[PDB]
Amino acid sequence: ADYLTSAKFLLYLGHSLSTWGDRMWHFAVSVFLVELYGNSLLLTAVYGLVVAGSVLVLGAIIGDWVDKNARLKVAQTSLVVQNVSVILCGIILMMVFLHKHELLTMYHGWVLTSCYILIITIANIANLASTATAITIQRDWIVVVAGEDRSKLANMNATIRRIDQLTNILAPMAVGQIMTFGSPVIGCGFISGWNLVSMCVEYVLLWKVYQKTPALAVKSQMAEPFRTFRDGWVSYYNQPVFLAGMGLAFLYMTVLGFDCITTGYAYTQGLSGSILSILMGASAITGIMGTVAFTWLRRKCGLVRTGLISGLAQLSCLILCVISVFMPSVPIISVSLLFAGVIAARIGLWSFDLTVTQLLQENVIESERGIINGVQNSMNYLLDLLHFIMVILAPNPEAFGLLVLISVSFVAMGHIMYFRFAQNTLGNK
Ligand SMILES: O=C(NCc1ncccc1F)c1coc(CCNCCc2nc3ccccc3[nH]2)n1
């Protein structure tokens, strides 16, 4: 089987072994914050606000970094930084858990706060490196490797999204089984070793994939970074794909996902391990269905029409969701219907994100694949930070109707901007 040694599968394996470690470490840090500190939302909110702004700035700066340096060296350095940061965070977490009872009492609260700050800073560096790697792989190496064959590019993006989704719903399950079967102290260390092994194998894998395809080779102190930062954003406006980016960012700011806040809505109305597993499995299955639907629609239509159709479907079932909210024992109809609306919204959302990311891949000048995508991630996290602020503005279980109304309104605005883009770049239906 020459497929195993082929470049496409090498890149698939590289991204799979990267995202598995990423998701496992995210789950580990979230569980650490939940377990060590009884209060989390306040802190997890601090984590969100220190990740989002740092990404907002250093992501444009990284987009400057990606296109400037060597193609392979930048990716290797990104992998090194991400895995080393995760290693340091794991070591600090192991030292904290081992001395859980030795600093809550004997040491001053400043020591615990300093440990939390060190974890926050190192995890922020890790996530910044993860964003750098995501850019340099997905938005540049996929385009180069897939080449002019647009269908191959679409299939590669769909496959990467499918493995991302399956890993996103499997990694928490495996880590929870590990922690329950073993111990939080022992299981946490397993992540450090797994990330080190993945570091070595991923370094080898990237070195290999670079050799398989030669096309990849062809290509006071704060004044300069802001020269690029000012240049990077204004470059985004000049590009014809700006409205698509804005629409994707507005969709990115969306409460009606299945993250911690919808998990808390579940705590309030209905919540169980079986229910969580069933809902997340349905979400993953429907995301896979959305990816395959995106591929099918791209086979039938082009790209902009596919994005328009996916947005219409997502907005339709979010209209169904807001109908469910509108309609007043336990209202089992309302919560289950809201979840079904979220599931179909995930279908449409994955389709739309694939469309927009492919358009950003195929409609950007060669030398600015780094800055433009870095700014697009910066904007995504800008509106994600606004989402976090809206969450902490009304962190009340019965203050969720307004939040969901705002989320659906922002989805509508994003799809309106995408329709404006379709009209701008296409004069026919
Ligand atoms: O609704 C969802 N996502 C919109 C969306 N995303 C991506 C593509 C299309 C699309 F439409 C949704 C649901 O689950 C998830 C998976 C988690 N990502 C959340 C983004 C995030 N991760 C963070 C980590 C640290 C700090 C801030 C962070 N912000 N994403």
- Write the DSSP string, 382-409: HHHHHHHHHHHHS--TT-HHHHHHHHHH
What are the phi and psi torsion angles at 207 (to 5°)?
Answer: -60, -40
Q: Which helix (H) or strand (E) holds 418?
A: helix 400-425
CB of 167 within 8 A of CB of 409?
no
53 lines ligand 1 (CB under 6 A): no
CB of 33 within 8 A of CB of 44?
yes
Q: Which of 128, 254, 346 most suits a substitution to test ligand 1, by most atoms within 8 Å of the C-beta?
A: 254
CB of 360 within 8 A of CB of 143?
no
CB of 85 within 8 A of CB of 77?
no
With a CB cutoff of 8 Å and minimum separation 6, the contacts of 395 are 41
Cα 310 versus chain centre, distance:
20
Number of residues written out for the chain: 429
d(CA 295, CA 309): 13
Minimal-distance CA residue to ligand 1 atom 23:
48
Six token digits for residue 80: 């090194």
What are the phi and psi torsion angles at 148 (to 5°)?
Answer: -70, -20
249 lines ligand 1 (CB under 6 A): no
Q: Which residue has the tokens 């290797």?
A: 76
CB of 74 within 8 A of CB of 290?
no
Query: Annotated binding site for Fe cation: which residue ranges?
Result: 22, 26, 260, 387
Q: What is the DSSP letter of 214?
A: G
CB of 63 within 8 A of CB of 372?
yes
Q: Which residue has the tokens 């590990």?
A: 178
DSSP states of 10-74 as a string? Answer: HHHHHHHHHHHHHHHHHHHHHHHHHHH-S--HHHHHHHHHHHHHHHHHHHHHHHHHHHHS-HHHH
Q: Report which of 50, 101, 136 is spatially closest to residue 388, judged by C-alpha positions.
A: 50
d(CA 223, CA 94): 40
3-state secondary structure of 218: coil
CB of 284 within 8 A of CB of 168?
yes
353 lines ligand 1 (CB under 6 A): yes
124 lines ligand 1 (CB under 6 A): no
Q: Report which of 338, 24, 339, 345 is spatially closest to residue 169, judged by C-alpha positions.
A: 24
CB of 411 within 8 A of CB of 318?
yes
Six token digits for residue 364: 């950007």
Please compute, for residue 232, the number of CA atoms within 13 A of its CA located in the half-sphere on the CB side.
Answer: 29
**CA quadruple 172, 175, 178, 184: dihedral positive or negative?**
negative
Taking the centre of ligand 1 as the mean of its atom positions, its distance from the CA of residue 130, in whole angstroms, is: 14
With a CB cutoff of 8 Å and minimum separation 6, the contacts of 167 are 16, 19, 20, 23
Q: What is the DSSP letter of 368?
A: G
d(CA 233, CA 239): 10
What are the phi and psi torsion angles at 38 (to 5°)?
Answer: -60, -45
**CA quadruple 49, 54, 60, 63: dihedral positive or negative?**
negative
Q: Report which of 393, 424, 123 is spatially closest to residue 244, judged by C-alpha positions.
A: 424
Q: Report which of 370, 389, 358, 385 is spatially closest to residue 131, judged by C-alpha positions.
A: 370
Q: Which residue has the tokens 């990467």?
A: 160
d(CA 102, CA 105): 6
Q: Report which of 51, 10, 420, 66 is spatially closest to residue 205, judged by C-alpha positions.
A: 10
Taking the centre of ligand 1 as the mean of its atom positions, its distance from the CA of residue 254, in whole angstroms, is: 9
Q: Report which of 127, 360, 389 is spatially closest to residue 246, judged by C-alpha positions.
A: 360
What angle is formed at CA 137 by the lines to CA 118 and CA 30, rounded to 5 degrees? 30
CB of 296 within 8 A of CB of 305?
no
Q: Alpha helices of 99-241 — where are they, by DSSP H?
A: 100-103, 109-134, 142-146, 150-181, 184-212, 223-238
Q: What is the DSSP letter of 222?
A: T
76 lines ligand 1 (CB under 6 A): no
d(CA 3, CA 291): 22
3-state secondary structure of 213: coil
d(CA 382, CA 391): 14
252 lines ligand 1 (CB under 6 A): yes
How much of the chain is in helix, strand and coil states, percent to nearest 5?
A: 85, 0, 15
Query: How close are the terminal C-alpha atoms of the chain, in Å?
Result: 44
Q: Report which of 261, 284, 345 is spatially closest to residue 48, judged by C-alpha positions.
A: 261
254 lines ligand 1 (CB under 6 A): yes
Residue type present at position 145: V
